[PDB]
Amino acid sequence: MLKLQTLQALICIEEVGSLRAAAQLLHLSQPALSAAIQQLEDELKAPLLVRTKRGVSLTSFGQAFMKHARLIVTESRRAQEEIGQLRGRWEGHITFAASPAIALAALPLALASFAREFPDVTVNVRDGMYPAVSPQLRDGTLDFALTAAHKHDIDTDLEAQPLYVSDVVIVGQRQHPMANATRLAELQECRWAFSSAPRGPGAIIRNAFARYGLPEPKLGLVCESFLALPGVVAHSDLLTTMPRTLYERNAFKDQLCSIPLQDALPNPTIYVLRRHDLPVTPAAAGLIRWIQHHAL
Amino acid sequence: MLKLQTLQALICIEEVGSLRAAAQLLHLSQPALSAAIQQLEDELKAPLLVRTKRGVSLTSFGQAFMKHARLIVTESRRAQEEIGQLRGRWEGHITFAASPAIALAALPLALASFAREFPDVTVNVRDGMYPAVSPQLRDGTLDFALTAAHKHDIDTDLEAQPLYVSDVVIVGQRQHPMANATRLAELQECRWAFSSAPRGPGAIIRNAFARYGLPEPKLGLVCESFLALPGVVAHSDLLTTMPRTLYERNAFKDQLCSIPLQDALPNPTIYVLRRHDLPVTPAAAGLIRWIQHHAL
Amino acid sequence: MLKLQTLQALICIEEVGSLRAAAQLLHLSQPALSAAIQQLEDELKAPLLVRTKRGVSLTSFGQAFMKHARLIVTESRRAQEEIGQLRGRWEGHITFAASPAIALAALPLALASFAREFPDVTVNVRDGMYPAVSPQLRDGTLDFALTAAHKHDIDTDLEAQPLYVSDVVIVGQRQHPMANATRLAELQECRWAFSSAPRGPGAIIRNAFARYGLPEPKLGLVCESFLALPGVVAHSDLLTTMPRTLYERNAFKDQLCSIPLQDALPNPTIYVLRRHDLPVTPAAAGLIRWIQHHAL
Amino acid sequence: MLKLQTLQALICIEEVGSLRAAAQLLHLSQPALSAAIQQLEDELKAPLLVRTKRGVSLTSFGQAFMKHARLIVTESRRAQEEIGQLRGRWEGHITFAASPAIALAALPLALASFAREFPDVTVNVRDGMYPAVSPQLRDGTLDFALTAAHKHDIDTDLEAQPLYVSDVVIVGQRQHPMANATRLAELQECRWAFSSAPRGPGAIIRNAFARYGLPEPKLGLVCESFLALPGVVAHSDLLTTMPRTLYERNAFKDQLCSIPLQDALPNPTIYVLRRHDLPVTPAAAGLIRWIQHHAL
Ligand SMILES: O=C1O[C@H]([C@@H](O)CO)C(O)=C1O
Ligand SMILES: O=C1O[C@H]([C@@H](O)CO)C(O)=C1O
């Protein structure tokens, strides 16, 4: 029998004056409790209980021992309470960073379902992108990030689980002069709103231009806000690249077009990124499952 | 004495985090980047970098030195760009942050106007809010921030110029239970998505509930991403506050509504914020001009 | 519920810092130490250990849990030792700390007396001072501390029993410039070696200079090691305060002197300090008895 | 010419109205300064100075540029001041741990000499031993430790430089019954005051007994305080092992003897131990040199 339940029982035996009565009160087996106390007495080499007409009393050794017993039972309760609070604070909070596409499609449906399965968790959500999220993942102020990355180029401190394979489209003002282009080379003369990517401003379009044999793309401006990007392109002649989800869910849809090229653009893999030494909360894993569920 | 040429070296080394990865400073001929840092370390008489687990890391001295290094480098660049501008050679950089209400309405029109008049100025557009923008204002890495703020509580070294008086609304899913509420008191029991604000996450609804005599609003989640907010609200029963301009310009407009409230809500003033003792380049001035104009 | 058997396992694992190095728990047959920790982790519902750079490290939960684990294990051991003692079987452990004035005079005589009467009790003797000893008093890892303290400023859960009223002297190199000073004011310009004390390093000379109307004493060095103090003073012109007993009993007595001062200095009371709610084992009681006796 | 001295000169030129006068004031070469300003003007593509009858004035471009120049000169001064303070605090403090032998012989003479060569450094000295010092060396609260260790068994985070090779002697009460022993086996019947060592209480004597084919040494008591050890052995029949320096410099010399065995005891190597990522202060290295100097 678990020692703490034995000590707990002795505490009860002191108050109600019977082994039998104590076992029934704490829902323990009489023959098991009796054998536990006996075992303990043999280890102690003294009796804790002396019989009377009514029941039992603590012996002299029993009274000495009970002071220790009382402190051990109390310490156990306090320990479980301290850690219950600390763990309660831990499990009750999630802080993460999401890419624009996850935030526009996956997250909203994920968050609804999640909050039913995990009703007691505050979630804190922010915009984020790798490599910028790396330092706060590392220093712990950020639990995980849901962001694009390149497998062969990720921090070693970080674990990376693929979430889904994403799409990138070239976007322009609805009647862009190059709306009918089928090739990258046909856009050499356009100016670009360099959108953000793991390898730097406009890295996706620069690298596309490079592999297809073209010079550097002509810069129009650098637009790091994905919130601002769709309207900016709508009121200018600048082209940009963006996630398909952003193109499909933005405020300026009817003023924009995509320019679908027969030349291939990349498919940025979206990753769960977190520090690997770190333990993941049940809720954190839960939220990931739900976002995953809506990223199929 | 310091060698201003080495400051960008240090800046670069802290960013890429590697000894060798820094060689893209066009030191693809020699590791005399080390000699350059040796000098800087002796001028300050303190170790700046440190042999580390994944490559190279700044010491506490290095970290302290960065804000000064960055202000020096960016002020030098601004000095040079200004002189050319004063000669009608309109080249150079502008980096600025914008709140969602500026970013979705005035900004697209202003950027296009500016680019037409100043075709060769490289502009960098970011999300940003006060007070988070303050340290990038302070080290010269942002020229200005277009953000909500409270006049009576802006840091002393910051210049604040009123740009726009914005409008707060209360937003929920289209067939929300409270869709037809007209009083703040009717929303007492609702769960909220705390959106970002100068005085902290959810400060607007928190401070409103307070003034209207209510208890703390009930937290559903913290959502710092304005890109994510409309959709989160669309696919749940969470209420939120948001700029009217965002309410009117998002991808989930069909699935949302604004609560027809007859209790009044705040009208946050959007400001142009700058570190006051920094002379504004003629080009940056030119852009603020345009944002003001389109801000109506 | 907790399994008290696993607590020593956890204790051991945190000390040796290794997964496998812990197998000296006589688990040289199986890694079912892991199963034991799995249970504990589930009882607390929190990760306790963490896969780490050099082996295994406690999580913040593990760290929080240690004081409770240690008090439980040591109270259980004390419960068992007491019972045997109450039966005239004088076996078990005593761990205690002592200040230099107790350690150099009363302690040698007391330990010898005690060992003659209680030949089989294992005694553990440590340096220690208040308040540094407090957390080891609190977690049961020290049975008592014999230390200077101030009555009006001892933590509430600590029992404090006057043992000895000690004597402070001011000590310097034998032919010190001030060797013949009779007034504290004459030592105003001297450099001091700050020795340890309850109110902080050099608190005695600091608080003396203050009461006698002087400015802050001049710091030469901080010397927490009483073993080192006499020699440091012997081979320099640094003055220090120290217990008269230490002044009288060190290896550099020939090369030292005490300043023949007619301004009075404090007489720190040495106390027997214990966490008050912990029942003192008969053996430990037996030793405190002897230390008291020899303390004269 | 260093750019900061150029900007500094332009600041001077604005105030005193002459290039010639400014070069002489700041002790710079006229032909060099003139060429520097010229070079700067060519890069700026505008003149900073216009001639008058007296001297020069800033041009319009000069006045624009000077605002930036003034800020860059000021920032440089502030940077050097911030880091000068931080580094000043760093270089002006040493905190270390010493073994009993170092503290009794090396340190006192080291500290005197050191403090002349490095007069502005607070030194904080404490008792310490490996492995106990390891966590605070690692977390930085302790600069270095001068302690015994075993080369083939030291933490990887730590660098270890040998300081000197030490001696261990068996010590007893002046007329110990075993004072004439020449072999370890002759002491099998004695009881020991287990003194502290890297591999645990009494590890030196246990391991000596083991290699010479003997059973475990009989325990008398565990004495972790090296301050207490000599008097404890003097007023009992317990034997101990200790550093030769402790045996030669303690308060109870005339009441003790050594028991020099023809059996060999170990020669514990004393190490400088520090975290290797950490930069060492000039003063810290200096103190080590002086302790080294007195450990020959
Ligand atoms: O910068 C780049 O953009 C794509 C990337 O999006 C693929 O995921 C790619 O291969 C690059 O080199
Ligand atoms: O514990 C031991 O004591 C000596 C050591 O002092 C040598 O430096 C040794 O070899 C052991 O195994």
Short mmCIF file of all heavy atoms in Angstrom, two decimals, chain B residues 1 4 43-45 50 53 61 64-65 67-68 71-72 75-76 79-80 82-83 86-87 277 279, chain D residues 2-5 43-46 61 64-65 68 71-72 75-76 79-80 82-83 86-87 90 277 279:
data_model
loop_
_atom_site.label_atom_id
_atom_site.label_comp_id
_atom_site.label_asym_id
_atom_site.label_seq_id
_atom_site.Cartn_x
_atom_site.Cartn_y
_atom_site.Cartn_z
N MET B 1 39.80 55.89 -31.45
CA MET B 1 38.51 56.44 -31.92
C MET B 1 37.80 55.44 -32.81
O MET B 1 38.45 54.66 -33.50
CB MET B 1 38.76 57.72 -32.70
CG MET B 1 37.52 58.53 -32.95
SD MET B 1 37.93 60.08 -33.79
CE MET B 1 37.93 59.53 -35.47
N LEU B 4 33.68 54.45 -38.31
CA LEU B 4 32.29 54.33 -38.74
C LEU B 4 32.09 53.26 -39.80
O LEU B 4 31.00 52.69 -39.93
CB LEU B 4 31.75 55.70 -39.19
CG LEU B 4 31.28 56.67 -38.08
CD1 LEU B 4 32.24 56.75 -36.89
CD2 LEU B 4 30.98 58.07 -38.59
N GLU B 43 38.86 50.03 -29.16
CA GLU B 43 38.39 51.40 -29.05
C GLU B 43 37.38 51.51 -27.92
O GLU B 43 37.32 52.49 -27.21
CB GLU B 43 37.80 51.95 -30.39
CG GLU B 43 38.75 51.91 -31.62
CD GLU B 43 38.07 51.73 -32.99
OE1 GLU B 43 36.87 51.53 -33.04
OE2 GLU B 43 38.73 51.77 -34.02
N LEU B 44 36.61 50.46 -27.75
CA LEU B 44 35.64 50.41 -26.71
C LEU B 44 36.23 49.73 -25.51
O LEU B 44 35.73 49.81 -24.44
CB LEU B 44 34.44 49.66 -27.20
CG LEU B 44 33.75 50.46 -28.28
CD1 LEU B 44 32.73 49.64 -28.96
CD2 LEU B 44 33.14 51.65 -27.64
N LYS B 45 37.34 49.06 -25.75
CA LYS B 45 38.10 48.28 -24.77
C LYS B 45 37.21 47.22 -24.10
O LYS B 45 37.19 47.07 -22.87
CB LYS B 45 38.81 49.18 -23.74
CG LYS B 45 40.10 48.56 -23.20
CD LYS B 45 40.75 49.43 -22.14
CE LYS B 45 41.92 48.72 -21.50
NZ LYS B 45 42.20 49.27 -20.14
N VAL B 50 31.51 36.90 -29.49
CA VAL B 50 31.87 35.78 -28.63
C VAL B 50 31.77 34.47 -29.39
O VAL B 50 30.77 34.21 -30.07
CB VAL B 50 31.05 35.76 -27.31
CG1 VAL B 50 29.82 34.87 -27.42
CG2 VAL B 50 31.92 35.32 -26.16
N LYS B 53 28.08 28.59 -29.69
CA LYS B 53 27.58 27.24 -30.00
C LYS B 53 27.25 27.00 -31.47
O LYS B 53 27.46 25.90 -31.98
CB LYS B 53 26.34 26.92 -29.15
CG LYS B 53 26.48 27.15 -27.64
CD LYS B 53 26.09 28.58 -27.22
CE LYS B 53 26.26 28.82 -25.73
NZ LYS B 53 27.65 28.55 -25.26
N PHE B 61 28.07 43.81 -24.02
CA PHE B 61 28.64 45.03 -24.56
C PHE B 61 28.21 45.23 -26.01
O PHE B 61 27.77 46.32 -26.37
CB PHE B 61 30.17 45.03 -24.46
CG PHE B 61 30.70 44.76 -23.09
CD1 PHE B 61 31.61 43.73 -22.87
CD2 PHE B 61 30.30 45.53 -22.00
CE1 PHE B 61 32.11 43.48 -21.61
CE2 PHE B 61 30.78 45.28 -20.72
CZ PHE B 61 31.69 44.25 -20.52
N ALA B 64 24.55 46.27 -26.15
CA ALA B 64 24.38 47.67 -25.74
C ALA B 64 24.80 48.63 -26.84
O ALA B 64 24.20 49.69 -27.03
CB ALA B 64 25.15 47.96 -24.46
N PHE B 65 25.82 48.23 -27.59
CA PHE B 65 26.40 49.08 -28.63
C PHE B 65 25.55 49.22 -29.91
O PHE B 65 25.76 50.16 -30.69
CB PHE B 65 27.82 48.61 -28.94
CG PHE B 65 28.58 49.53 -29.83
CD1 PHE B 65 28.99 50.79 -29.38
CD2 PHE B 65 28.91 49.14 -31.13
CE1 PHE B 65 29.69 51.65 -30.21
CE2 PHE B 65 29.62 50.00 -31.96
CZ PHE B 65 30.00 51.26 -31.50
N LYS B 67 22.24 49.90 -30.76
CA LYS B 67 21.35 51.05 -30.95
C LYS B 67 22.13 52.27 -31.42
O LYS B 67 21.72 52.95 -32.36
CB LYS B 67 20.49 51.34 -29.71
CG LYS B 67 21.24 51.53 -28.39
CD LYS B 67 20.28 51.89 -27.25
CE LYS B 67 21.03 52.35 -25.98
NZ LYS B 67 22.05 51.37 -25.43
N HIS B 68 23.28 52.51 -30.78
CA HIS B 68 24.21 53.57 -31.19
C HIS B 68 24.82 53.35 -32.58
O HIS B 68 24.86 54.28 -33.39
CB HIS B 68 25.30 53.72 -30.15
CG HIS B 68 24.77 53.94 -28.78
ND1 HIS B 68 23.91 54.97 -28.48
CD2 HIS B 68 24.95 53.25 -27.63
CE1 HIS B 68 23.58 54.91 -27.20
NE2 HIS B 68 24.20 53.88 -26.66
N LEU B 71 22.01 53.94 -35.25
CA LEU B 71 21.65 55.35 -35.39
C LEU B 71 22.72 56.10 -36.18
O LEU B 71 22.41 56.91 -37.06
CB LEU B 71 21.45 55.98 -34.02
CG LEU B 71 20.66 57.27 -33.76
CD1 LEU B 71 21.56 58.49 -33.64
CD2 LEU B 71 19.49 57.52 -34.75
N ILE B 72 23.98 55.81 -35.87
CA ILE B 72 25.13 56.35 -36.59
C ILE B 72 25.11 56.01 -38.09
O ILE B 72 25.23 56.90 -38.95
CB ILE B 72 26.45 55.92 -35.92
CG1 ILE B 72 26.59 56.63 -34.55
CG2 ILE B 72 27.65 56.24 -36.80
CD1 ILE B 72 27.69 56.06 -33.65
N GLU B 75 21.92 57.55 -39.77
CA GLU B 75 22.00 59.01 -39.82
C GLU B 75 23.01 59.43 -40.90
O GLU B 75 22.78 60.39 -41.64
CB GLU B 75 22.39 59.58 -38.44
CG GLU B 75 22.00 61.04 -38.17
CD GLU B 75 20.53 61.35 -38.43
OE1 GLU B 75 19.65 60.46 -38.33
OE2 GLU B 75 20.24 62.52 -38.74
N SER B 76 24.12 58.70 -40.99
CA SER B 76 25.09 58.95 -42.05
C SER B 76 24.45 58.77 -43.42
O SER B 76 24.71 59.56 -44.33
CB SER B 76 26.32 58.06 -41.91
OG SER B 76 26.90 58.23 -40.63
N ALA B 79 22.09 61.68 -44.05
CA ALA B 79 22.87 62.89 -44.35
C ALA B 79 23.20 62.98 -45.84
O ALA B 79 23.00 64.02 -46.47
CB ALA B 79 24.15 62.93 -43.51
N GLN B 80 23.69 61.87 -46.38
CA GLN B 80 24.10 61.75 -47.77
C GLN B 80 22.91 61.83 -48.75
O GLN B 80 22.99 62.55 -49.76
CB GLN B 80 24.88 60.45 -47.96
CG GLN B 80 25.23 60.10 -49.40
CD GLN B 80 26.63 59.52 -49.53
OE1 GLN B 80 27.09 58.74 -48.68
NE2 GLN B 80 27.33 59.91 -50.59
N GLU B 82 19.89 63.20 -48.18
CA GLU B 82 19.42 64.59 -48.09
C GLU B 82 20.17 65.55 -49.02
O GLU B 82 19.54 66.32 -49.75
CB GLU B 82 19.51 65.11 -46.66
CG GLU B 82 19.05 66.55 -46.54
CD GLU B 82 18.99 67.02 -45.12
OE1 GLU B 82 19.98 66.85 -44.38
OE2 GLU B 82 17.95 67.58 -44.74
N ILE B 83 21.50 65.50 -48.99
CA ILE B 83 22.33 66.39 -49.80
C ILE B 83 22.00 66.22 -51.30
O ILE B 83 21.87 67.21 -52.03
CB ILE B 83 23.88 66.20 -49.55
CG1 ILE B 83 24.28 66.46 -48.08
CG2 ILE B 83 24.72 67.03 -50.51
CD1 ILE B 83 23.97 67.86 -47.55
N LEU B 86 18.61 67.72 -51.92
CA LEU B 86 18.74 69.17 -51.96
C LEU B 86 19.30 69.65 -53.28
O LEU B 86 19.19 70.83 -53.63
CB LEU B 86 19.60 69.67 -50.80
CG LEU B 86 18.96 69.53 -49.42
CD1 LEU B 86 19.94 70.02 -48.40
CD2 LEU B 86 17.64 70.28 -49.32
N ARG B 87 19.88 68.72 -54.04
CA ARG B 87 20.35 69.03 -55.38
C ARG B 87 19.40 68.50 -56.46
O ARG B 87 19.74 68.50 -57.64
CB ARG B 87 21.79 68.54 -55.57
CG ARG B 87 22.77 69.31 -54.70
CD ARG B 87 24.10 69.53 -55.39
NE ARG B 87 23.89 69.88 -56.79
CZ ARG B 87 24.82 69.86 -57.73
NH1 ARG B 87 26.08 69.53 -57.43
NH2 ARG B 87 24.50 70.18 -58.98
N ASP B 277 14.46 64.91 -32.54
CA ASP B 277 15.74 65.56 -32.87
C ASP B 277 16.39 65.06 -34.16
O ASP B 277 17.50 65.45 -34.49
CB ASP B 277 16.72 65.53 -31.68
CG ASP B 277 17.33 64.17 -31.43
OD1 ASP B 277 16.87 63.14 -31.97
OD2 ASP B 277 18.30 64.12 -30.65
N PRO B 279 16.54 65.20 -38.12
CA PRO B 279 16.06 65.99 -39.26
C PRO B 279 15.46 65.08 -40.33
O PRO B 279 16.08 64.09 -40.73
CB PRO B 279 17.31 66.71 -39.76
CG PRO B 279 18.44 65.86 -39.32
CD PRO B 279 18.01 65.08 -38.12
N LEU D 2 40.13 59.56 -40.40
CA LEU D 2 38.96 59.08 -39.64
C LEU D 2 37.76 60.02 -39.74
O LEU D 2 37.85 61.20 -39.41
CB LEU D 2 39.35 58.85 -38.18
CG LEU D 2 39.54 57.46 -37.56
CD1 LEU D 2 39.80 56.37 -38.57
CD2 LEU D 2 40.67 57.54 -36.55
N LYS D 3 36.63 59.48 -40.21
CA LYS D 3 35.44 60.28 -40.45
C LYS D 3 34.96 61.07 -39.23
O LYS D 3 34.54 62.24 -39.36
CB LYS D 3 34.31 59.42 -41.02
CG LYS D 3 32.93 60.05 -40.95
CD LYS D 3 32.71 61.15 -41.99
CE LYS D 3 31.87 60.64 -43.14
NZ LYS D 3 32.69 59.87 -44.11
N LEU D 4 35.01 60.46 -38.05
CA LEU D 4 34.59 61.18 -36.85
C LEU D 4 35.44 62.40 -36.60
O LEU D 4 34.90 63.42 -36.15
CB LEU D 4 34.58 60.29 -35.61
CG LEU D 4 33.26 59.64 -35.21
CD1 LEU D 4 33.48 58.80 -33.96
CD2 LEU D 4 32.16 60.68 -34.99
N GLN D 5 36.75 62.34 -36.88
CA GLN D 5 37.58 63.54 -36.69
C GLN D 5 37.27 64.61 -37.74
O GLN D 5 37.28 65.81 -37.43
CB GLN D 5 39.10 63.30 -36.46
CG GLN D 5 39.81 62.25 -37.31
CD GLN D 5 41.27 61.95 -36.85
OE1 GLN D 5 41.63 62.11 -35.67
NE2 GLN D 5 42.09 61.49 -37.79
N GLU D 43 32.11 62.84 -52.41
CA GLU D 43 31.12 61.80 -52.10
C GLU D 43 29.71 62.38 -51.93
O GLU D 43 28.74 61.74 -52.32
CB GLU D 43 31.49 61.04 -50.83
CG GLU D 43 32.72 60.19 -50.97
CD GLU D 43 33.31 59.76 -49.63
OE1 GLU D 43 32.79 60.15 -48.56
OE2 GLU D 43 34.32 59.02 -49.65
N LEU D 44 29.61 63.56 -51.32
CA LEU D 44 28.32 64.19 -51.09
C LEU D 44 27.82 64.87 -52.35
O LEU D 44 26.62 65.07 -52.52
CB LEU D 44 28.41 65.19 -49.94
CG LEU D 44 28.55 64.59 -48.54
CD1 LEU D 44 28.86 65.68 -47.51
CD2 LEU D 44 27.30 63.80 -48.15
N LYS D 45 28.75 65.19 -53.25
CA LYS D 45 28.47 65.89 -54.51
C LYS D 45 27.98 67.32 -54.27
O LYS D 45 27.22 67.87 -55.07
CB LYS D 45 27.54 65.07 -55.41
CG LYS D 45 28.19 63.79 -55.91
CD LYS D 45 27.22 62.89 -56.68
CE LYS D 45 27.95 61.65 -57.20
NZ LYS D 45 27.14 60.86 -58.18
N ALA D 46 28.44 67.92 -53.18
CA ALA D 46 28.19 69.32 -52.87
C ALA D 46 29.25 69.90 -51.90
O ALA D 46 29.87 69.17 -51.13
CB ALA D 46 26.76 69.51 -52.31
N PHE D 61 24.08 73.44 -48.01
CA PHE D 61 24.20 71.99 -47.87
C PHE D 61 24.94 71.68 -46.59
O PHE D 61 24.68 70.66 -45.94
CB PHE D 61 24.93 71.36 -49.07
CG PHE D 61 24.44 71.86 -50.40
CD1 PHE D 61 25.15 72.86 -51.09
CD2 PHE D 61 23.28 71.35 -50.98
CE1 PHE D 61 24.70 73.34 -52.32
CE2 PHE D 61 22.83 71.83 -52.22
CZ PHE D 61 23.54 72.82 -52.89
N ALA D 64 22.60 71.89 -43.63
CA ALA D 64 21.76 70.70 -43.62
C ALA D 64 22.53 69.51 -43.08
O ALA D 64 22.02 68.76 -42.23
CB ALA D 64 21.24 70.39 -45.03
N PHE D 65 23.77 69.35 -43.56
CA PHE D 65 24.60 68.21 -43.21
C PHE D 65 25.04 68.23 -41.74
O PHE D 65 25.12 67.17 -41.09
CB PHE D 65 25.82 68.16 -44.14
CG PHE D 65 26.72 66.98 -43.91
CD1 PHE D 65 26.39 65.72 -44.40
CD2 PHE D 65 27.92 67.13 -43.21
CE1 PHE D 65 27.22 64.61 -44.19
CE2 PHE D 65 28.77 66.03 -42.99
CZ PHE D 65 28.42 64.77 -43.48
N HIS D 68 23.04 66.42 -38.99
CA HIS D 68 23.35 65.01 -38.95
C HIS D 68 24.70 64.79 -38.28
O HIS D 68 24.83 63.95 -37.39
CB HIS D 68 23.39 64.42 -40.35
CG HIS D 68 22.08 64.51 -41.08
ND1 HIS D 68 21.05 63.62 -40.87
CD2 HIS D 68 21.66 65.36 -42.05
CE1 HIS D 68 20.04 63.93 -41.66
NE2 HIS D 68 20.39 64.98 -42.39
N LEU D 71 24.67 65.08 -34.56
CA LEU D 71 24.07 63.89 -33.95
C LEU D 71 25.00 62.66 -33.95
O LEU D 71 25.02 61.88 -32.99
CB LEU D 71 22.74 63.55 -34.63
CG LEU D 71 21.59 64.53 -34.42
CD1 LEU D 71 20.49 64.28 -35.44
CD2 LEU D 71 21.03 64.48 -33.01
N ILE D 72 25.76 62.50 -35.04
CA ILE D 72 26.70 61.39 -35.16
C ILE D 72 27.88 61.54 -34.17
O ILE D 72 28.35 60.55 -33.59
CB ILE D 72 27.23 61.23 -36.60
CG1 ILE D 72 26.08 60.90 -37.55
CG2 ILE D 72 28.32 60.16 -36.69
CD1 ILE D 72 26.35 61.26 -39.00
N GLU D 75 26.32 60.83 -30.69
CA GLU D 75 26.02 59.42 -30.50
C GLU D 75 27.29 58.64 -30.21
O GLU D 75 27.33 57.80 -29.30
CB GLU D 75 25.28 58.85 -31.72
CG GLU D 75 24.58 57.51 -31.47
CD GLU D 75 23.38 57.62 -30.55
OE1 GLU D 75 22.83 58.72 -30.39
OE2 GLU D 75 22.97 56.59 -29.99
N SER D 76 28.35 58.94 -30.96
CA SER D 76 29.66 58.33 -30.73
C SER D 76 30.15 58.55 -29.30
O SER D 76 30.63 57.61 -28.67
CB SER D 76 30.69 58.86 -31.71
OG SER D 76 30.21 58.69 -33.04
N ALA D 79 27.82 56.42 -26.91
CA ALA D 79 28.18 55.01 -27.05
C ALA D 79 29.43 54.70 -26.23
O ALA D 79 29.45 53.76 -25.43
CB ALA D 79 28.41 54.65 -28.53
N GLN D 80 30.47 55.50 -26.42
CA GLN D 80 31.71 55.26 -25.73
C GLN D 80 31.52 55.40 -24.24
O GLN D 80 32.14 54.66 -23.47
CB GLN D 80 32.81 56.18 -26.24
CG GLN D 80 34.11 55.43 -26.50
CD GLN D 80 34.76 55.85 -27.79
OE1 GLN D 80 34.10 56.33 -28.71
NE2 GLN D 80 36.08 55.67 -27.87
N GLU D 82 28.47 54.87 -22.55
CA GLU D 82 27.68 53.73 -22.05
C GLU D 82 28.61 52.54 -21.83
O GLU D 82 28.67 51.99 -20.73
CB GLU D 82 26.54 53.35 -23.01
CG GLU D 82 25.79 52.08 -22.58
CD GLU D 82 24.40 51.91 -23.21
OE1 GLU D 82 24.14 52.46 -24.30
OE2 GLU D 82 23.57 51.22 -22.59
N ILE D 83 29.35 52.17 -22.87
CA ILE D 83 30.20 50.99 -22.80
C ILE D 83 31.34 51.17 -21.80
O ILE D 83 31.71 50.22 -21.14
CB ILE D 83 30.70 50.55 -24.20
CG1 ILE D 83 29.75 49.52 -24.82
CG2 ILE D 83 32.09 49.93 -24.11
CD1 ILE D 83 28.33 49.99 -25.09
N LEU D 86 29.66 50.28 -18.44
CA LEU D 86 29.46 48.83 -18.42
C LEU D 86 30.78 48.06 -18.28
O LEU D 86 30.91 47.23 -17.38
CB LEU D 86 28.69 48.38 -19.66
CG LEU D 86 27.23 48.80 -19.86
CD1 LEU D 86 26.77 48.34 -21.22
CD2 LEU D 86 26.31 48.26 -18.78
N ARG D 87 31.75 48.36 -19.14
CA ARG D 87 33.08 47.74 -19.08
C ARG D 87 33.82 48.09 -17.78
O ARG D 87 34.52 47.25 -17.22
CB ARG D 87 33.92 48.12 -20.30
CG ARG D 87 35.43 47.91 -20.16
CD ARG D 87 36.22 49.05 -20.81
NE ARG D 87 35.96 50.34 -20.17
CZ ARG D 87 36.61 50.81 -19.11
NH1 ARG D 87 37.58 50.10 -18.52
NH2 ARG D 87 36.29 52.00 -18.61
N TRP D 90 32.48 45.93 -15.22
CA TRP D 90 33.00 44.59 -15.51
C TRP D 90 34.44 44.42 -15.03
O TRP D 90 34.73 43.51 -14.25
CB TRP D 90 32.91 44.34 -17.02
CG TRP D 90 33.40 43.00 -17.51
CD1 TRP D 90 32.95 41.77 -17.11
CD2 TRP D 90 34.38 42.76 -18.52
NE1 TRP D 90 33.62 40.78 -17.80
CE2 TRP D 90 34.50 41.36 -18.68
CE3 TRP D 90 35.19 43.60 -19.31
CZ2 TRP D 90 35.39 40.77 -19.58
CZ3 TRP D 90 36.08 43.01 -20.22
CH2 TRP D 90 36.17 41.61 -20.34
N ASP D 277 33.05 29.86 -22.66
CA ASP D 277 32.53 30.89 -23.51
C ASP D 277 32.93 32.29 -23.00
O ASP D 277 33.16 33.18 -23.79
CB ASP D 277 31.02 30.74 -23.69
CG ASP D 277 30.57 29.29 -23.59
OD1 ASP D 277 31.03 28.61 -22.64
OD2 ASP D 277 29.79 28.83 -24.45
N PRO D 279 34.47 35.74 -21.60
CA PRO D 279 35.65 36.61 -21.64
C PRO D 279 36.20 36.89 -20.24
O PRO D 279 35.44 37.15 -19.31
CB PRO D 279 35.10 37.90 -22.25
CG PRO D 279 33.96 37.46 -23.09
CD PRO D 279 33.34 36.29 -22.36
#
